[PDB]
Amino acid sequence: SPGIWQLDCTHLEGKVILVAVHVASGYIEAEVIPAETGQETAYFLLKLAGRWPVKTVHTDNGSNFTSTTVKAACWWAGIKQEDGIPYNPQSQGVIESMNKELKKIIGQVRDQAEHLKTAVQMAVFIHNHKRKGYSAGERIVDIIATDIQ
Amino acid sequence: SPGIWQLDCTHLEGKVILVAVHVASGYIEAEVIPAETGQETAYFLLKLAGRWPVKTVHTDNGSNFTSTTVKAACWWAGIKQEDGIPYNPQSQGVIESMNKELKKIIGQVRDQAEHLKTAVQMAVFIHNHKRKGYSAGERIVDIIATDIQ
Numbered sequence: 001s002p003g004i005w006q007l008d009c010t011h012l013e014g015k016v017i018l019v020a021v022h023v024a025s026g027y028i029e030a031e032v033i034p035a036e037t038g039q040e041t042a043y044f045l046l047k048l049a050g051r052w053p054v055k056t057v058h059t060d061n062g063s064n065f066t067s068t069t070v071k072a073a074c075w076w077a078g079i080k081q082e083d084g085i086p087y088n089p090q091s092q093g094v095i096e097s098m099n100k101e102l103k104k105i106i107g108q109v110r111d112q113a114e115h116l117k118t119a120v121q122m123a124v125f126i127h128n129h130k131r132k133g134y135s136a137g138e139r140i141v142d143i144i145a146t147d148i149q
Numbered sequence: 150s151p152g153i154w155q156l157d158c159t160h161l162e163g164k165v166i167l168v169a170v171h172v173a174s175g176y177i178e179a180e181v182i183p184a185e186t187g188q189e190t191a192y193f194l195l196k197l198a199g200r201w202p203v204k205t206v207h208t209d210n211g212s213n214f215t216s217t218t219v220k221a222a223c224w225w226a227g228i229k230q231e232d233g234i235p236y237n238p239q240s241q242g243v244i245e246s247m248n249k250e251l252k253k254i255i256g257q258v259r260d261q262a263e264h265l266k267t268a269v270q271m272a273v274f275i276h277n278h279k280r281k282g283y284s285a286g287e288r289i290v291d292i293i294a295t296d297i298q
C-alpha cells in the first residue's frame with residue numbers, strides 16, 4: 001500500500017483538474033489541463049513517478065486504462081497500471097468528498113490569482129498541509145520511510 | 150537542513166530548465182519554461198512547497214531574489230526566501246556537476262520523446278531513483294521522516 005496511487009479527474013471553469021491521490025495518506029498532486037487526454041495523463045504520471053515511489057496506479061477511467069500512451073508511460077516509469085473499479089464502495093465516496101473539498105478550497109483562494117492553475121496549486125498546498133494530529137504530507141513521508149526501513 | 154532547497158537554472162535547446170534541489174539529499178524537481186521570469190519562478194516554488202515541506206529556498210540569482218512576485222509566492226507558501234551566495238565554495242561545484250549530470254541523462258533519453266519537457270521529466274526520474282546504497286528519493290523521505298519524529 002505505500003506505493004499505491006489513484007487518479008481522479010474533476011472539472012472546473014471549463015477546464016480539467018487531474019489529481020493523483022496517495023491512497024494510504026490522502027496526499028495529492030494535481031494539475032490543470034485543457035482536456036483529459038492519454039498524452040496529458042501519461043505526462044502527469046511520468047512527473048509523479050519521478051517524485052514519489054509509485055508502484056501502482058489505479059486509473060480514473062477506462063479511456064486512460066486503455067490508452068497506449070498511458071500504458072507506455074507506466075511501462076517507462078515502472079508503474080503497474082490497474083483499473084479503478086471500486087470493489088470497495090467506500091472509494092467512490094472518499095474521491096467524491098475529496099473533489100468537493102478541493103473545489104471548496106479553490107473557491108476560498110480563487111480571488112488570490114488570475115489563473116485557475118495557481119488556485120489549484122494553492123489548493124494542493126492547503127490540502128497537503130491540513131492537520132486532521134498529522135497532515136497528509138506528514139503521513140505520506142512516514143508511510144514511505146517506514147517501508148524503506 | 151530538512152527544509153532547505155536550492156534553485157538552479159540551466160539552459161538546453163534554447164529553453165530554460167528550472168531545478169530545485171533538496172540540499173541534504175540531492176533530490177530534485179524540475180520543469181522546462183521558455184524563459185526564467187519571476188512569474189514562472191513563483192509558480193514553480195508554489196508547486197514545490199505544496200509537495201514538500203519547503204522551509205527555506207536559496208534563490209538561483211539576484212533577479213529571482215529581488216522579484217516581488219517570487220517574494221509574494223514565498224510569503225504565500227511560508228518559505229524563507231534567501232540569497233544563493235556560495236559562502237561554501239563547494240556549493241557552486243555541486244550545482245555545476247548536477248547540471249552536467251542532468252544534461253548527460255537528457256542526452257541519453259532524448260530520442261525517447263519529441264518534447265524536451267518529457268526528456269527532462271525522464272531525467273528527474275532517473276536522477277531521483279539512482280542508487281549511489283540509497284537513492285536521493287530514499288534519502289529525502291528518511292531525512293524528513295526523521296525530522297517529523
Ligand SMILES: COc1ccc(CNC(=O)c2ccccc2C[NH2+]Cc2ccc3c(c2C(=O)O)OCO3)cc1
Nearest residue numbers: 111112113114115118188189191192195218221222225
Ligand atoms: C505563485 O506566486 C504567487 C504570487 C502572488 C500571489 C498573490 N496574488 C496576487 O498577487 C494576485 C492576485 C489576483 C490576481 C493576480 C495576482 C498576481 N498574480 C499571481 C500569480 C503569480 C504567478 C503565477 C500566476 C499568478 C496568477 O495570477 O494566476 O499564474 C501562474 O504563475 C499568489 C501566488
Ligand SMILES: COc1ccc(CNC(=O)c2ccccc2C[NH2+]Cc2ccc3c(c2C(=O)O)OCO3)cc1
Nearest residue numbers: 039040042043046069072073076260261262263264267
Ligand atoms: C510520458 O509518456 C511517455 C509515453 C511514451 C514514451 C516512449 N516514447 C515514445 O513513444 C516517443 C518517442 C519519440 C517521439 C515520440 C514518442 C511519443 N510521445 C511520447 C510523449 C508522451 C507524452 C507526452 C509527451 C511525449 C513526447 O514525445 O514528448 O510530451 C508530453 O506528454 C515515453 C513517455
